[PDB]
């Protein structure tokens, strides 16, 4: 059949006159996402993800009303198989190479600070706190899942190192201060380029969003762009205290295991192998 042909009735309604076979489908974990020129249509795979999709729509509405200094995917249409249509954020990721220009780095660091500040401020808002996930002991849950699912795939020395990293996690205070994207890698931050210096267009892939600890997003930024750049962001934003540094480092050190854990569950052996490097 094919996903485009399969969902053609809805697509003709949502995208009138648009040739379905000219569209792209991004194969998400929970959602099949059809990509059109200015918007996407999120389709659930499981009955689980179909059930959650109303709340996802509510979450995206809230995000669309925050002051983050940039765009987010705005809900344009929801209904029923449930569907959610989101605005498509323009722009492309910034390759790390661009940050070798120090004046680019300054401007990019500044816009990250605005974004992170906006997210931080938003966590104080009770309206936001009502609509967004705010789980407790997410890290001790993670640790138990690593031990259960990953430790059997690991060497003795691997298991020893991981146990050290999972120990550090219990040292972390369960902070729920900020809106936390949860997966704020380079690919999820889009820029306008070739019009002077890069301007932050918007942020995408809010599936992991929650009220939590901002150190998670800062760790993600450092993972994508390196220590120097993160340091630049931390200084500009006044987040360069030891206390923050510890949380960032603790969280950062879980990133390979997180990748292994999710690659384990969804039977992606390339990601699992890469994630388990040094642990076996």
């Amino acid at each position: 059949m094919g996903i485009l042909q399969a969902n053609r009735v809805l697509l003709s309604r949502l995208l009138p006159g648009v040739e379905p076979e000219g569209l792209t489908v991004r194969h998400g974990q929970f959602h099949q996402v059809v990509i059109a020129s200015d918007r996407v249509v999120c389709l659930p795979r499981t009955a689980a993800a179909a059930a959650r999709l109303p709340r996802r729509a509510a979450v995206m509405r809230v995000l669309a009303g925050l002051d983050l200094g940039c765009r987010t995917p705005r809900p344009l249409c929801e209904g029923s198989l449930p569907f959610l249509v989101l605005s498509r954020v323009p722009g492309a990721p910034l390759e790390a190479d661009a940050l070798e220009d120090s004046k680019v780095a300054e401007v990019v660091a500044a816009q990250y600070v605005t974004l992170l500040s906006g997210l931080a401020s938003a966590g104080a808002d009770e309206k936001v706190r009502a609509a967004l996930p705010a789980p407790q002991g997410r890290w001790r849950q993670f640790a138990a899942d690593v031990r259960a699912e990953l430790f059997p795939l690991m060497s003795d020395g691997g298991c020893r190192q991981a146990e050290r990293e999972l120990a550090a996690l219990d040292s972390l205070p369960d902070i729920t201060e900020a809106v936390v994207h949860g997966n704020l890698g380079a690919e999820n931050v889009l820029w306008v380029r070739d019009d002077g210096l890069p301007r932050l267009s918007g942020v995408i892939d809010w599936d992991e969003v929650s009220i939590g600890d901002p150190a998670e997003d800062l760790a993600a930024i450092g993972a994508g762009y390196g220590k120097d750049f993160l340091d630049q962001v931390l200084t500009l934003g006044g987040w360069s205290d030891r206390r923050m540094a510890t949380r960032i480092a603790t969280i950062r050190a879980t990133f390979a295991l997180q990748q292994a854990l999710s690659a384990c569950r969804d039977g992606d052996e390339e990601e699992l192998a890469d994630g388990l490097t040094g642990y076996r």
Binding site: N183, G185, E216, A220, A223, F255, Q258, Q259, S262, E271
Partner: peptide, 6 residues
């Protein structure tokens, strides 16, 4: 829910 190392 850091994916591919973030």
């Amino acid at each position: 829910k850091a994916s591919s190392x973030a």
